[PDB]
Write a protein that binds this ligand. Structure first.
Ligand SMILES: *[C@@H]1O[C@H](CO)[C@@H](O[C@@H]2O[C@H](CO)[C@@H](O)[C@H](O)[C@H]2NC(C)=O)[C@H](O)[C@H]1NC(C)=O
Ligand SMILES: *[C@@H]1O[C@H](CO)[C@@H](O[C@@H]2O[C@H](CO)[C@@H](O)[C@H](O)[C@H]2NC(C)=O)[C@H](O)[C@H]1NC(C)=O
Ligand SMILES: *[C@@H]1O[C@H](CO)[C@@H](O[C@@H]2O[C@H](CO)[C@@H](O)[C@H](O)[C@H]2NC(C)=O)[C@H](O)[C@H]1NC(C)=O
Ligand SMILES: *[C@@H]1O[C@H](CO)[C@@H](O[C@@H]2O[C@H](CO)[C@@H](O)[C@H](O)[C@H]2NC(C)=O)[C@H](O)[C@H]1NC(C)=O
Ligand SMILES: *[C@@H]1O[C@H](CO)[C@@H](O)[C@H](O)[C@H]1NC(C)=O
Ligand SMILES: *[C@@H]1O[C@H](CO)[C@@H](O)[C@H](O)[C@H]1NC(C)=O
Ligand SMILES: *[C@@H]1O[C@H](CO)[C@@H](O)[C@H](O)[C@H]1NC(C)=O
Ligand SMILES: *[C@@H]1O[C@H](CO)[C@@H](O)[C@H](O)[C@H]1NC(C)=O
Lengths: 397, 114, 397
């Protein structure tokens, strides 16, 4: 699998991004910059401007019709309104799917990083503390037996080497905290936004159906409140299109060059080799962790050889301390299982799949949901404008 | 940190028997790696016998096969060489060595066959 | 994470299974046996009987009404048709998402299995041929070895041990062939079904548009063609309901216990130890690959140290087979790289995540899509029946 920018990201990214003074600004994604923010609020204000122009058109046409076919166009307005609600339902569902995909990928990355950190801490503590305590006990009992104390010092030195080469690994405490904060913020914003958009769709369908109800038969006095609610939802739909366009432009500017942005965000918290390793899997290249894991496994094999030999060549001479020599071997083989797990978690594929899934989620699903919500806003604005400007229609006398 | 002590060397007559002991202090005998070397006054140091660490597998050179046996005495932290059927060109300075990195060859135990 | 048992799967599995002549059947997923096909055919015949009853009732009611707000009811039926088309679009999109997710999960599992097989085959071939060739060349050039041929023999021995251990690893050629076949079949069937159901949606939209156009002007030829196409389209909608209900029942009752079925099928393909490890991820337990990987790692470390000793102690002595000894050192470094690339792809994490994602695609999204599609079929049948009910008053009125 590989990541390439699909056509819609390229099309949206090429949309001009200028400030309030129309000055061209670097289009690279950088939310911290004030200039980029002002660039996106420029498109927001452009959307507000076209909203104002559309309202001016409605008021002018309404006053012209009042001072100075039709029912088919009203029915058509209702139909396009319903189609807009449907398209918006699909787009909101897709955007929610993208947001949940991003949250799931972030949670998977959090779990895999916390597993690495937990294994690092557990192995370091286990080896250093418990191995030193046991080794002190063996040196206590193996006293006055030279070669045995020399081998004990050897395994102590190998333990020190393991501790050094294992601490020489990234510690993702702050990375875990950042991932957790991002996941919680995404959850809050996404849930509230989905509630808001579901409420908007419900109100849109409700007002469309009940406005057509008045036109159909029975009472006709509803149309005044129907017009008021239609105008409110029309301005709300214009604001929705503004927000959706701004968010889509920002997400596309992120998605065109996501690897560079991620690599230049995690600059001090994370090493450069590790990030370049996870973002671009080095199937042809060499894993940066390979040397540390190799030293770890070589040291563990040497420990196992020495301890097994000690078990086999110390029963007759001492007949004691074998009750904790079995314990030190059990500790070593548990650490071997820990090493297998650790080299299974630090692999490029594990985090790279999560990152690629998050990228596909955000870009594909989220931004297609975004332009589909923008299209919903456009059709809703069109149908709302037509149904508001349908005219007094004799006030149904 | 390791030291080597060689003992048992002496002057012997052709076809006798003797045992050399190469004491160890920093590496356990026949537990990491063991090796036995010799050298004549004018000559290059030459291999005679060796022990592999765990399995007690021993090998001997062609000219020395079937006459010397080298053992593993874990009780007193020592390696023995049992020389049997000595011949006059077996007169040389004998050594034991290792190839582990704990250290290297120690000193000599003179064995002369007359 | 573990596959939690959902609720709608349980509800759809709780439906009685009768087969052909009121036998309780078993309701435990068993493809390729007569009882299960009989139950699915029962469900299909139930929907066919419902179609026949609907047809007979509609014809009889129409004849009775002819022999003895309707425009509003026709417009309501058209609106229900449009809503059914939208919900069918949603259901088909969800079903296609589930099918593509299943195909992608199977593709990734195939990639991991192919990688495992490529790695094991490459390492065993490289070792058994190139490494044996290199010791054969070095043994002869080394003259009067003695001390050295023992180390060379041990290297050959431990290489034999590691190659035996790697041969003990399962071979996944048959599994990847089966996965390729399943993926190809899934792609072909899903593409054809998506195209057919999109054609059905197009037919429904077109016939609804013709009905709406003919409701404006009372034209006999247009009404006749519209009704002739509508009856045909309702028979297809009922048949689609039949097929979709049968498929939904099958998928739901496979969902209630997928692990036992996938274990039953994989009784000769893969040893039970491997499948029980992959399906569950008992993170607090052991792993069937632990011992062979431990032996691989120990062999590689010990051959590393022995070859390094020979290299750094033989150049001052012989310096003739130095290219050969560098060659075996390079082979050993490469085997270290492939080992670190091997103990991560055989891990529980990747395949368990693939299995959970495939399940979620086929069971969460897939069954939701099938239920939505069945709801679309039922709504289309109801709307077509309501439209037909307005047929007698469409003529002469
Ligand atoms: C990310 O993983 C971390 C692992 O540290 C989770 O932290 C745990 O969170 C629970 C509550 O959910 C606490 O009770 C535990 O004490 C936390 N553990 C530690 C070691 O701090 C965290 O919840 C995960 N976050 C997400 C969003 O999944
Ligand atoms: C070291 O870890 C391994 C994990 O398998 C254990 O290996 C077993 O060792 C016993 C005792 O020699 C053998 O009889 C078994 O055949 C080994 N198991 C396997 C699956 O090969 C070993 O017990 C662990 N060490 C300790 C002290 O528990
Ligand atoms: C499943 O994996 C197999 C691994 O063999 C893939 O087979 C390869 O397919 C490519 C084209 O996709 C061919 O160029 C190779 O020659 C095939 N290799 C062999 C050994 O036959 C197969 O394509 C994969 N299937 C899927 C759906 O990903
Ligand atoms: C196998 O790997 C090592 C480590 O990458 C290669 O280089 C050795 O690196 C260590 C650590 O810096 C040095 O002490 C050694 O002297 C290096 N060995 C050399 C230069 O021969 C090693 O070269 C690799 N083996 C081969 C055949 O390429
Ligand atoms: C944007 O930033 C990039 C960073 O490489 C720079 O090369 C470029 O000139 C800047 N401006 C534009 C208009 O791309
Ligand atoms: C990109 O990296 C450079 C490296 O010097 C840094 O100065 C700059 O602030 C970074 N900018 C962004 C937008 O990531
Ligand atoms: C299904 O058959 C199994 C044995 O194959 C039996 O245990 C079970 O009771 C049967 N009925 C069910 C699951 O309703
Ligand atoms: C599935 O496997 C179980 C357990 O081995 C066995 O009892 C059963 O007969 C198998 N087949 C079916 C169709 O359940």
């Amino acid at each position: 699998v590989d990541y390439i920018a699909p056509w819609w990201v390229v099309w949206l990214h090429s949309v001009p991004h200028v400030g309030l003074r129309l000055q061209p600004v670097n289009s690279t994604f950088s939310p911290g910059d004030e200039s980029y923010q002002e660039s996106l609020l420029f498109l927001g204000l452009v959307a507000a401007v076209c909203l104002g122009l559309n309202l001016i058109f409605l008021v002018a046409y309404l006053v012209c019709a009042c001072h100075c076919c039709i029912t088919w166009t009203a029915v058509v307005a209702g139909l396009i309104c319903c189609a807009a609600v449907g398209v918006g339902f699909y787009g909101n569902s897709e955007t929610n799917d993208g947001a949940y995909q991003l949250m799931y990928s972030l949670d998977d990355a959090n779990h895999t990083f916390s597993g690495i950190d937990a294994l690092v801490s557990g192995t370091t503590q286990k080896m250093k503390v418990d191995l030193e305590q046991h080794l002190a006990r063996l040196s206590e009992i193996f006293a006055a037996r030279g070669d045995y104390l020399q081998t004990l010092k050897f395994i102590q030195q190998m333990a020190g080497s393991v501790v050094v080469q294992l601490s020489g690994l990234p510690v993702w405490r702050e990375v875990t905290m950042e991932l957790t904060k991002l996941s919680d913020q995404t959850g809050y914003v996404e849930y509230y936004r989905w509630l808001s958009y579901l409420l908007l769709f419900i109100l849109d369908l409700v007002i469309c159906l009940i406005a057509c109800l008045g036109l159909a038969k029975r009472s006709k006095c509803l149309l005044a409140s129907m017009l008021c609610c239609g105008a409110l939802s029309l301005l709300l739909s214009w604001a929705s299109l503004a927000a959706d366009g701004s968010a889509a432009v920002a997400t596309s500017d992120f998605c065109v060059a996501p690897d560079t942005f991620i690599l230049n965000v995690t600059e001090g918290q994370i090493s450069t080799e590790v990030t370049r390793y996870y973002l671009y899997c080095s199937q042809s290249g060499s894993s940066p962790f390979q040397q540390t894991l190799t030293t770890f496994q070589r040291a563990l094999t040497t420990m196992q050889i020495q301890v097994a030999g000690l078990l086999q060549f110390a029963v007759p001479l001492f007949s004691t301390a074998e009750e904790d020599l079995l314990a030190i071997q059990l500790l070593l083989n548990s650490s071997e299982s820990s090493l297998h797990q650790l080299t299974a978690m630090v692999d490029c594929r594990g985090l790279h799949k999560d990152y690629l899934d998050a990228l596909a989620g955000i870009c594909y699903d989220g931004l297609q949901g975004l332009l589909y919500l923008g299209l919903f806003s456009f059709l809703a604005a069109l149908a709302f404008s037509t149904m508001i400007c349908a005219g007094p229609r004799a006030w149904k006398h | 940190q390791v030291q080597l002590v060689e003992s048992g060397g002496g002057l012997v007559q052709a076809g006798g028997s003797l045992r050399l002991s190469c004491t160890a202090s920093g590496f356990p005998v026949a537990f990491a790696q063991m090796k036995w070397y010799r050298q004549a006054p004018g000559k290059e140091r030459e291999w005679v016998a060796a022990i592999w660490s765990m399995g007690n597998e021993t090998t001997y050179a062609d000219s020395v096969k079937g006459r010397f046996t080298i053992s593993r005495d874990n009780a007193k932290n020592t390696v023995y060489l049992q020389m049997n059927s000595l011949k006059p060109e077996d007169t040389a300075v004998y050594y034991c060595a290792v190839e582990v990195g704990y250290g290297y060859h120690g000193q000599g135990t003179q064995v002369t066959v007359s």
